[PDB]
Design a protein around this ligand. Structure first.
Ligand SMILES: [Zn+2]
Ligand SMILES: [Zn+2]
Lengths: 153, 153
């Protein structure tokens, strides 16, 4: 019965809180929360490798990718473990987040506990942008806000 | 060889960066780093249970205490897992952290990954103050700064 939480903070206006929950070891992990200050539209939402905030969001490193694969969407076979696709902000600039994923975990070697969630500047192209960036970052651009994923009550 | 890192931010001027290093499962964790903006003297320095920053340092909860024991210093038999004792700040306000502990770990059951480091307002009395607070928090006072312990490169 795992639960985690993540508070997102950056230099700019973007912030938010992401709650995680996983009933058991072989179960999907359900994310819920909200992000504010986003420009309207889809924004790439990824788990990055390191829970390192010494240089802002930069020190989080690449998308969490223990299996040395290429960037893709959550539904794809070829994906980094931390590829959660996009979240969507309205004209509001507010994004309700609700994502269910079977590839990320709150325990075992796939464990995202102690890693970083980041929401990105642009939409994640899910690996179909026709350049190398696409197969790497999904062309989602700069890191607006991030937090270390921590164990929650 | 496991590495972790912690960026402390609080409401006031207190900030810092704690690095953690454990070369092997059965080995001590070695903390190093620096905290600035402290009053000269000793300040309680503890691992709290939750990596929850939704309500500042408050949402971190109690000291990490999986074995339902009472507060003590790092050297005591009866201690919480997160009882790392005190750090010392010079006239500087600068505290140079260097602690080595065998009870905390960066993996396993005593894993502090995804939990919270906090530097407190006052000196930790190591659970010897003869009141209820002592047995719980070492009478270390409020929480000046904190951060989620994250996986580092
Ligand atoms: Zn990716
Ligand atoms: Zn304690």
């Amino acid at each position: 019965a795992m639960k985690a939480v993540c508070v997102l903070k950056g230099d700019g206006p973007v912030q938010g809180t992401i709650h995680f929950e996983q009933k058991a070891s072989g179960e999907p992990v359900v994310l819920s929360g909200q992000i504010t200050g986003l420009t309207e539209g889809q924004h790439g939402f990824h788990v990055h490798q390191y829970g390192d905030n010494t240089q802002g969001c930069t020190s989080a490193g690449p998308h969490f990718n223990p299996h040395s694969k290429k960037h893709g969407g959550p539904a794809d076979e070829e994906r980094h473990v931390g590829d959660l696709g996009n979240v969507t902000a309205g004209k509001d600039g507010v994004a309700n987040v609700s994502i269910e994923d079977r590839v990320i975990s709150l325990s075992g070697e796939h464990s995202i506990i102690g890693r970083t969630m980041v929401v990105h500047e642009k939409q994640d192209d899910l690996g179909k942008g026709g350049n190398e960036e696409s197969t790497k970052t999904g062309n989602a651009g700069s890191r607006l806000a991030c937090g270390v994923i921590g164990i929650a009550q």
